[model samples]
Structures are given as C-alpha cells and as structure tokens.
Target: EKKSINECDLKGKKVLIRVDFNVPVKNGKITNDYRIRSALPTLKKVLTEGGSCVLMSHLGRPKGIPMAQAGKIRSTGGVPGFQQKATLKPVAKRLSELLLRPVTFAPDCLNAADVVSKMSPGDVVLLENVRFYKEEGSKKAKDREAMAKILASYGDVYISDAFGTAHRDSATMTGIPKILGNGAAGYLMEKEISYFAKVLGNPPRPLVAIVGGAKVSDKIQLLDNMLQRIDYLLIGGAMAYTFLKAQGYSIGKSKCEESKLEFARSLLKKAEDRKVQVILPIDHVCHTEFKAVDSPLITEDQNIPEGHMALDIGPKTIEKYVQTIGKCKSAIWNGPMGVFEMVPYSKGTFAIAKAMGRGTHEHGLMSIIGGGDSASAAELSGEAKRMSHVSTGGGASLELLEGKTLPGVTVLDDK
Candidate 1:
C-alpha cells in the first residue's frame, strides 16, 4: 500500500530516519523504553545494509525556546525549562545501550549536516530535539520548507519510522520527504499501518471494537466509522453515560454530553440497522466521589442516585463483555472501561485487557490494543505483550480508525 524501507536500496547511503522517541522522562531518567525499542528493527536493518543513519526526533514540547535562553537554562539547571527537560541525550544514551554501539550526538539537528558528512557507512548519529527550532513545527509554509531543506541535505534517503506522528503535518514528516523524494515507511510504521488496514479493511468474522473514554464527542467519528464495518460494538468509560441517557436512563452525577445524546442515539440506530450488536453497561460500580478511599456501590438498575457517580462497569457487565470478547475472531480496543489509574475503578479495564490477551493467545483472535489510555491499561495489566499489536500512536491511530488520510503517511512514496 505504501513504499517501505525494504524496497529502498540503502547501501552506502546516508539515511535520515525520523523516529518517535517521545518517551516519558523524569530528571533525565527514561521511565518507559518501549518507544525506543520499537524502532530498533528498522535501525538495525539500515546499519546491516551498509547505510549510515542520521536519526532525528522530538523529545518533548520545547516551544521554540531561543538558543540563548536555552543555553542559560542548561547552565543554570533551571526548573521547568523546555530545553533542559526536552533534551534527547537520554534517548541517545538508551539507543547506544540497545544498539551496542556508540551514538554520536549533535547539539542541533540543523547543524548535523557536518557530522553526517564525515560519517562512514553504518555509523549512527542522533540529532538533538528537532522542536528546538521553531520552524520544525511552524504553520508557515516557508519556515517549514526552509528547515526541512536543511534536514534533507544531510541524507540521501528519508525513512519515516515515526508512526506516532503520522497524523501530524510537521516539517520533518512532510517537508523533508518532499525534498528527498525517496521517503519510505520504517518497519514499525509498516507494521502499525498493516495491522490497522487488516482490522479496518478485511478481517475475520465476528470483529468487535471496544471503545471507552471520558467523552462521547471525542470518539464520535471513530464510533461512526467502526459501526459500518464491525460485527459488534462495546461501549464503556464515562462516555457510556451519554448513550445511557439517550436511552432514557438516569445517569445521575456521571459524566454525560447532553448535546451528543441525539448523536449517540443515531449511532445505535445505525448499528441496529446494519445488524451490528451494540452493547452498553447494564450495571455500574458507583461512587460518591472519585477517590481511592470511597467504597464502590453496585447499582441494581441503570439509575444512579443524584449524589453518586458511576465509575466503572459492575461485575455483571464485566462477565458479559468477557463472554462477548471470547467469541470474537478479531478485536480493536481503545480507551479504558473505567478510570483505570486508581485501584478502586480499575477492575473492568483490567478484566477486558486480560480477556483480550486470552482471546489472542488461545481463541485465535487478532487482538489490537489501540494506543493512548487503552495501551497504558494493557501495559498496566501486563497483557500488552499478549496482544497481536499495541499501537504507539494514540491520536494517529484514532485518526486512521476514523478513515482519515494522515499527512505524514500520504506524503510518503506509494507502491
């Protein structure tokens, strides 16, 4: 469907690789190393093919701090400084350990052309945070193109392995690819796209989608698109309250979008007309306050008291979801069944994660854990490794599920 890194002749070439290394860092310590590991296959492939890599990525939101201020902040170790906090030094260090080689670090990504000029085949150089330059993410076309041209000048091939930023139309993603005219998807990007294509285009029968989140409005397009292709739709999270309210249930103090009630009703009607089973929580675990200390109350009916808030799905609902998931041949899950961060309201989400793992491990299910909170929930349950695919891109994954064309993906060469 798209040009891949395998199709490129990378021998004796300087390959500019864009990867998503935006991992969680606290005081220069990498909290999660999954994102770094995800790009290793593609990185190893380039090196093994006698290609030198000029790796570029944004660590965090630098907000285009001026170099003078950035230098001052770095010298002083100031609190909450973008330059100090968003540095890629830790990422480069982690990559060096993973690759078992010394990675040359460039202070500025734009100035890395000189470093790349001296690199031999298989030599790896990691550039500083690209977002440090304001033009990397500038809305103005001229600024983006100017910055992109500088990046493109350092390499012969542009490998876009950053699926996490595929939906973004940033300078490195679109502009550099346009200049190089040899853009290709990296292995991680290829894998992410391929799995999503299978789930959205053609999948085994009894395909189901589990969608949860805080608001129905956030997933309206996702729900609408999936309803057309899925065999079953399971709704959870605080968003279910809106659907319940549309069905004339009293949601009480639980979160609900009153304006989206009609839209929610329409989605149900559409699903019913298309013969897709739509499942909502039949019972709920209610709480007086969203606190770990509060004891949860199991609701006998859909009605929640004025003072109580429905925090999670009740035991009956969890059993129902588990049974339904066990029968599915394919499943794509996004969001969490409840506020999964806290111990009191984590059971429903954890149960679904475990069930998905079981489905994939023993029941021949093609399980995909969509990114964002659902991915986090799966990791928390220690079931992410059991799923067929766990997406690294949260917003990008959701946009793909909505059937939207991503700028970064579209800009690449097509096969």
Candidate 2:
C-alpha cells in the first residue's frame, strides 16, 4: 500500500529525508541512543546504494513566543532559535559516532542550499532542527506550499522516515513531500505502519482497546473508530470521568469534558447496541489535589466526593481490567489509567502493562502499546520486551488507531 525508500532509484541521488530524531536530550547530552540506532538501516540503505541524504527533523517544538501553558503545548517543539536544550547538534554527533564518519552539519535547513550543493554519493548532511523555523508547523495551507518549495529544492526525492510525526500536517511532513512529488516511506516508517495495519486491520478474535488519557476531545474520534472494531472497551484516565458523569455517576470535582458528555453517552449507547462490552472503572484512588502528599483515599464505589479527584483506578477496577485483558486475543492500549508518574497512582496503569505482558508471554495474545505514556509504562513494567510492539509515535499512532489517514503517510507515493 506504500512505497518504501528501496523502491526509489537511490543511485546518484540526493535524497531529502524527514526522520523523527526526537530522541531525549539531557543538558545537551543524548540520554538514549536507541532512536538513532533504529534509523541506521534506511540511512545505510541510502548510502550503500551511492545516494547522499539531506536529513531533517523537528526537536522540541519551537514556538517563537513564551509558552503560555506547559500542558497546553505539545512536547515535540520548543521556542525557535538557539534553545541549546533542543538542538540536534548532539544527535548529529551521536549519528557520526555510530557511523564512524564525519557527517556534515548545516546551521539551518532554510539556508542549507549551499551544503546540499556539494554533497555527493557518500555524503550525509544533517540539517539543523526543523522546528527552528516558525513556518514548520501550523502554517496556512497556502504558506506551506512556499516552504515546501524551499525544502524540496535540496533533493531529487523525498523519503519520510519520521513515523513519530507522521500524524501532523507540518510543512516538512506534508509540504516538502508534496512539492517533491516523489516521496516514499523509509524502513522505520514502513515497519511501524505495517505492524499497526496488520493488527488493527485484521486482528485475531476478541480484539480490545484499553483507552485512557486526560481529555475526551481526542478520545471521542478514537473511540468512535474503535467502537466499530473492538469487542471490549476499557475506559480509564481522567477522561473516564466524562463517561462516568454521562452514565449518571457523581464524579465530584474531577476533570470532565463539559462539552462531550452527550457524545460520550451516545457512544456508550452505540457500544451497547452493538453488543460491545464497555468497561468503566468501578472504584478509584481519590485525592484532594494532584499533590501526592497524604495517603490515597480509595472510593468504595465509582463516584468521587465533592472535595476529591480520582488519581488512579482503585484495586477492584484494576483487577477487573486485568482479568478482562487476559481473555483477549489481541489488545491495543493507549493512554494511562492514572497519574502513573507518581508513586501511589501508578498501580492501575502498571497492572495493565504487566497484564498485557503476561497475556503476550504466557498466552498467545497480541498486545500493542500505542506509544507515549503507555510505552513508558510498559518499559517501567519491565515487560516492554514481551509485548508484540510498542510504537514510537504517540500522536501519530493514536491518529492511526482513530481510523484517520495521516497527512504525511498519505502524501507518500503508493507502491
């Protein structure tokens, strides 16, 4: 269904490649080299076949102004220009270290026409962080075209290797490839896409989706798509409050999407009509504030008191979720049931991670973690290796699971 880089004539070509080099950086040092190591196959493919590569990727999102709220902004980008913390200089050095060759580094992607001008077969030029430009994301459709022209000028072909950012319609992701009119999936992109496709498209019997997260906004579309495919729907996280409220449960002072209650009720009705088992948390570990100061107050029923908010799913709900997961033939998990970052509230999400692991390890169940928080939970559970696949792209994977055609992937040439 998609064209990979191998399908292109790599010989004597200068390839403009978009890869998600959004690896973790701590004080200008790469904390993990896995992201770079994972990308070597496609980069090696381009090089071994006598092709040069002009690589581009966004680091921490670069929004040129002071960030209004930390929670409101996506972590993918940072403030524009030299925010030493978000630069790819360390990444290029790490790539060079991995390849044992000096990779040329361009100071700016917009002004890199000179670097690509001299690149020959065996040359690899790493462009400075793409998010550095204000035009990389959320540009007007009309404006993206102009940016695409400037980027597409550097190469003969466009290859998208950044499955992590494929869900977005950022200029580099869609604009560059649209301008080139010759875009293909890289190996990493191909691999991530195929696994999700096979599992979600034709999963085994008793397929389920463990849906969790902070908001009901993204979940509504995702749940709608999954309602058609899933047999069991285990709802968790703060979003569960919206559903709880819709079902006439008193959710007290919890986070609820005041607007999506009707939608939640309708979706629940739809699930019941279709004979899909909808599992909402029965009990919760409540708290006065997000602060984990005192002992967690476990609620006897689903309702929260006026003074409290549920920080995690209680033992009973965790037990039920775990039991239901064991019976599934396949499971797709997104989001976390609680504030898993804290000590007391981590029980619910951690148990589900281990349950999926055991389901895959002990039984033959197919478990796929849709990246981001769930992936971190899996890794923390020490069962990440047991699950069938943990995706790299949180937002991208969620969009795919929502049954949406991604802008970056769709713009690529079809095989």
Structural similarity to truth (TM-score) of each candidate: 0.92, 0.87
Report the alpha-carbon TM-score of model 2 versus the true structure. 0.87
Q: How does model 1 score by TM-score? A: 0.92
Best by lDDT: 1
> Model 1 misses residue 8 by how many Å?
1.6
lDDT of each: 0.87, 0.85
Q: Write the per-residue lDDT of candidate 2 for residues 12-124, one digit (tens) a residue.
A: 99988898788888888888777788788899999999999899987886653211232233344433354687788888999999988778988666667888899999999
Which residue runs of candidate 2 sit more than 4 Å off their true CA positions? 64-80, 293-295, 380-382
List all candidate RMSDs to the true structure. Answer: 2.9, 5.3
